[PDB]
Amino acid sequence: GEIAQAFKEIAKAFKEIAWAFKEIAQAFKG
Amino acid sequence: GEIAQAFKEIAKAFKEIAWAFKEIAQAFKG
Amino acid sequence: GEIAQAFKEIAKAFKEIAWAFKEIAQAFKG
Amino acid sequence: GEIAQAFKEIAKAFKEIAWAFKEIAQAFKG
Amino acid sequence: GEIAQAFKEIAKAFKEIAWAFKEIAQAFKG
Amino acid sequence: GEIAQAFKEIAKAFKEIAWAFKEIAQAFKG
């Protein structure tokens, strides 16, 4: 289904956003 | 229908947010 | 109905967010 | 329902994070 | 009910991330 | 299913992020 595919893409983007947030936090902490 | 179309547009925006986040994280690495 | 309308409004909100973070990614170039 | 409500709350928080990112990037340039 | 629960937890965390970014932006303004 | 598991993982990652930026925000005060 198109909706199921969109959810998969949204999950993948959330994980990429999470990883970028963690890199930014490391930049401020260091 | 219209619900599937809205989810495709949500997914598109999420992909663009994830890309921007990766760009921002890369700027904090120089 | 209003289920469709809710996801349509979510699509608009995240398009606004995508615009915002594209501008932030550009602002870090300067 | 509950998923749409959570998307809306996430969108509102993203917008506040975007505004703060803008002020931070602007600070780095004067 | 798992996906709705996960979305509620994501929304909770985003509210807290937003609070922190607003504090950080205020620090850069003073 | 799998998509529920993906969002459960995302929830755990963003709670870690909220924790990280709580510390960063309070470090910007002294």
Author numbering:
A (entry chain A), B (entry chain B), C (entry chain C), D (entry chain D), E (entry chain E), F (entry chain F): 1 to 30
What does the paper say about this structure?
CCs are quaternary structures comprising two or more α-helices supercoiled around each other with cyclic (Cn) or dihedral (Dn) symmetry. Here, we describe variants with all combinations of the aliphatic residues, Ile, Leu and Val, at a and d to give four classes of peptide: the ββ class, with a and d = Ile or Val; Lβ, a = Leu and d = Ile or Val; βL, a = Ile or Val and d = Leu; and LL, a = d = Leu. Peptides are named systematically appending the one-letter code for the amino acids at the a and d sites to “CC-Type2-“; e.g., CC-Hept becomes CC-Type2-LI. In summary, solution-phase data and X-ray crystal structures demonstrate conclusively that different classes of Type-2 coiled-coil (CC) peptides—i.e., based on abcdefg repeats with predominantly hydrophobic residues at a, d, e and g—adopt a range of distinct states.
